[PDB]
Ligand binder design. Structure first.
Ligand SMILES: *[C@@H]1O[C@H](CO)[C@@H](O)[C@H](O)[C@H]1NC(C)=O
Length: 542
């Protein structure tokens, strides 16, 4: 009951701006449909797969040797995403160190980082973005220094203030990873108790603000022409495969340490319900503050704030300033963000390290060296996003690191398991380790329903690709080519392993094909001609 109530950093940071970009209310229908239909069966499947085989993401594919490329690809994606989850924690630490004063920097506009185009509503061009407010100017010119960068072709040198925070973050991550595979006994009760209090207070404060009804009536309004467009569905599926965490190797790696009696069905149901409730509450709280901000600045809701990764670092500080004793609440809130980010990064590092160490057994005798290598590589690669123009690099990464790639990996996992290993064998394994057989709904969603929706989403995300933009900035085409190369770097790993394994195995075509779809512990049945996959009754099993 401590592994289901835990909140994830994605629901707090990434969901608010994806909901605001696709409008309120119209984003929740595809989100909920995808949530149920794909996420619940796939979350349950990933929980059940690791608990039975006692293996990591890469070594779990001893039931079908042709699908180890998927395990490699999910580990590569987890490495890619950890490159830019560190910059958010650095921003949170910088914001926390700025809150130890009685005059918050984001309240007035008379500092050294202020442009002469700044107006203060308290001390007082249609479809554009408004960025002359003290909070937006603070975020863009005191922590990012974006005004010395003209584009991704001119990014400049890293900022030392953010470098000093990234160095602390990586050191903490290393020293919380170098002695064991759990190292989590302390922080399991701060990550699941504090966010609920913070959102509960902020919800009441937002709904009592003036002009928040104009934002509530915009969150409860359902736009229908905003549907029948690929962007909302592609965003919803991707956000699901960030909020639940399937497609990164974390669930398989952490389920391999459970007890062989654990009920994964209850855990999946509880996690899905809590995720849905938290997402809805976060959207309501975000739109109340959006309505208040639109009211105070005499602008429109669609033009009051940006649609990037720094939406929370502008709205949440602005809602903090309207409370009583703002310094206490800012400290609490940024502590909550720091804890959430640290937990997410620790989970990703555990996933990567366990997946890579389960395959090569020499890395199990040198854990400090491997952890140091992973952390140092992450630091070196994250140095790119703390430059003067690092927001463009971070946007490109957040767009192309887990896009079509994660959907392809999740589709391949489901197809592989449910069609080659056998939905009947996968249901007899749950029968063995839980005492009850899953049921018709799960067996149908594992084999027919989820793969079809995933294939449709994958195809549509390629057919209707949109060029990258950041607010009013338009990337050059070679940036899109670079992003597509990064996306394909993980997707290409699957067909390569099927060729390598086929060429590495000796014998005729029949023997080479049989040895790669048969579990490694049943390889003695290949010389007796007893392969179940060469029969129609194996492919007609529902
Ligand atoms: C800032 O204000 C000045 C005043 O004329 C002018 O350059 C313009 O309105 C603003 N600049 C930008 C880049 O919007």
């Amino acid at each position: 009951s401590v592994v289901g109530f835990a909140v994830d950093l994605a629901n707090v940071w990434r969901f608010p701006y994806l909901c605001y970009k696709n409008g309120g209310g119209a984003f929740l229908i595809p989100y909920t449909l995808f949530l149920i239909i794909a996420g619940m069966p796939l979350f349950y499947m990933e929980l059940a797969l690791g608990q039975y085989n006692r293996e990591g993401a890469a070594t779990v594919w001893k039931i079908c040797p042709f699908f180890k490329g998927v395990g490699y690809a999910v580990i590569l994606i987890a490495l890619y995403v950890g490159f830019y989850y560190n910059v958010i924690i650095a921003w949170s630490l910088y914001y926390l160190f700025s809150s130890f004063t009685l005059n918050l920097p984001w309240t007035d506009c008379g500092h050294t980082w202020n442009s002469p185009n700044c107006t203060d509503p308290k001390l007082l061009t249609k479809y554009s973005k408004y960025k002359f407010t003290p909070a937006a100017e603070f975020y863009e010119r005191g922590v990012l220094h974006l005004h010395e960068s003209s584009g991704i072709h001119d990014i400049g040198l890293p900022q030392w203030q953010l470098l000093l925070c990234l160095m602390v973050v990586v050191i903490v991550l290393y020293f919380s990873l170098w002695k064991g595979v759990k190292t989590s006994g302390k922080v399991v009760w701060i990550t699941a108790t504090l966010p609920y209090f913070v959102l509960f207070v902020l919800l009441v404060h937002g709904v009592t603000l003036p002009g928040a009804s104009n934002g509530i009536n915009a969150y409860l309004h359902i736009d229908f022409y905003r549907l029948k467009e690929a962007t909302v569905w592609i965003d919803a599926a991707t956000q699901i495969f960030f909020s639940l965490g399937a497609g990164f190797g974390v669930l398989i790696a952490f389920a391999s340490y459970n007890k062989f009696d654990n009920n994964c069905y209850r855990d999946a149901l509880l996690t899905s319900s809590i995720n849905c409730i938290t997402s809805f509450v976060s959207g309501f709280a975000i739109f109340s503050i959006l309505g208040y901000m639109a009211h105070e600045h005499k602008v429109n809701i669609e033009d009051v704030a940006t649609e990037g990764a720094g939406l929370v670092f502008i709205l949440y500080p602005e809602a903090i300033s309207t409370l009583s004793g703002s310094t206490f609440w800012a400290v609490v809130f940024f502590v909550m963000l720091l804890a959430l980010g640290l937990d997410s990064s620790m989970g990703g590092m555990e996933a990567v390290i366990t997946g890579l160490a389960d395959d090569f057994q020499v890395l199990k005798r040198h854990r400090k060296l491997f952890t140091f290598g992973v952390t140092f590589s992450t630091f070196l690669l994250a140095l790119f996003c703390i430059t003067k123009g690092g927001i463009y690099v971070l946007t490109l990464l957040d767009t192309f690191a887990a896009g079509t790639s994660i959907l392809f990996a999740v589709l391949m996992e489901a197809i592989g398991v449910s069609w080659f290993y056998g939905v009947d064998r996968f249901s007899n394994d749950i029968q063995q380790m839980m005492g009850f057989r899953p049921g018709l709904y799960w067996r149908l969603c594992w084999k027919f329903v989820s793969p079809a929706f995933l294939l449709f989403v994958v195809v549509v995300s390629i057919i209707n690709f949109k060029p990258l933009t950041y607010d009013d900035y338009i990337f050059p085409p070679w940036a899109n080519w670079v992003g597509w190369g990064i996306a394909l770097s993980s997707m290409v790993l699957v067909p390569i392993y099927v060729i390598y394994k086929f060429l590495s195995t000796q014998g005729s075509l029949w023997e080479r094909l049989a040895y790669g779809i048969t579990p490694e512990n049943e390889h003695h049945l290949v010389a007796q001609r007893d392969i179940r996959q060469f029969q129609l009754q194996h492919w007609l099993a529902i």
